[PDB]
């Protein structure tokens, strides 16, 4: 009857039963209550994002007025005083990416106190223009705890499951791709390699095949947007921890680029290695005769050698380091650096080989993919020298998703690796590192400046010829 409905309605109006969506807001509120540091700021941006999403979906909900006010109080707390200076740019980002906004927010707090003026605007501009900082949903839902490894993706292979499985199992029986686990009931692979790491193993056909089917599954998950297979894998299948770690590291690298532009002594680099300094180094070099004396000039009051490699052949650097390893050793060199290999994926494999004398399948596949001579590693091990991988984790692609940010990111991250691995060897120990010529020079783009490897390590960029003649390459202005 109408009485029963009248009573039901009076009860409903007084104690509005809580939907799933409003429950999410209350849960998120508790997080604002309990969290500390940057977590509390992120939780506050995420509270706001939940409120906006709620009001959008329940336009005529009675709860909107009290949620709106809550949203303004939160916003007022966050952007009080000088923090309002960066508010418009940070809040616009917080609309889609609360954790990202919170990181920038912490930087803006410092900028309000007068640290690194300009960094905040730089981070905001990257967040808007770098395709890799765009909103990335990734894989949502429960992920297994069993895996002996950190999953980077959880990819539903659908129709490509059987092929992927075959080539994965062929790979695993040859010691490759061990950090991958199949769940047949959902046709998914839990995958412990990044897109870029896999690409570095495709000298092995079985990996190349597995990689091919992985990519097909990705393309089929998103046929409509123009996203590459790599970007699709992130936005649709990335583990959430992996996403955070990517976003975090990219923000770190932007700060790195910023600091390096102010703290690198480029004035002194140009005095030593341009103009008169260059003329003088070139003259002293040309008067020396043979490998021994050229080395002594190049390493005189310098921590190492930087040798350029050109796209195509000119593998003269790789050849030289191998054939003349003894002459390098006698001049104090104890470390050989290769931009050809990625530090995260390769260094554990390299180190285990130098310790045990046993080369893993995985390293053997990487060397093959990169066309590196196994004898370099044997000659290094026999000579007591360490080989170190110098590249970061992103695409070497001079084009990455259509902007300059991929280029700057790689140069930034490679600069950091170089400083950590090459810049402070024990007293007397020198290095020889081989870089592609693009990293040796500075990046002077409209979208930002990055010091060259040369600038960061206070060294000239070198070229070695078919007859072991060194020359100093002029700075790319």
Numbering used by the authors: -4 to -1, 3596 to 4068
Text taken from the publication that reported this structure:
Given that the catalytic residues of VvRRSP were successfully assigned, we hypothesized that substitution of catalytic residues with nonfunctional residues might stabilize the active site and the adjacent flexible region. We subsequently determined the structure of the RRSPE3930L/H4030L mutant at a resolution of 2.3 Å. The structure of the mutant RRSP is essentially identical to that of WT RRSP (RMSD of Cα atoms is less than 0.5 Å), with minimal differences in the conformation of the active sites containing the essential residues. Like WT RRSP, the active site of the VvRRSPE3930L/H4030L mutant is arranged similarly to that of BcR135. Luckily, the flexible region spanning residues Arg-3988–Gln-3992 in molecule A of the mutant is ordered and adopts a loop structure close to the active site. To evaluate the involvement of this region in the function of RRSP, we selected Arg-3988 based on its interactions with the Switch I region of Ras, dominated by negatively charged residues. This residue was mutated to glutamate, and the overall conformation was confirmed by CD spectroscopy. In vitro KRas cleavage assays showed that the mutation completely inhibited enzymatic activity, suggesting that the flexible loop may be involved in substrate recognition. No differences in the active sites were observed between WT and mutant RRSP structures. Therefore, these results suggest that residues Glu-3900, Glu-3930, His-3902, and His-4030 in the active site may spontaneously adopt the catalytically active conformation in the presence of substrate.
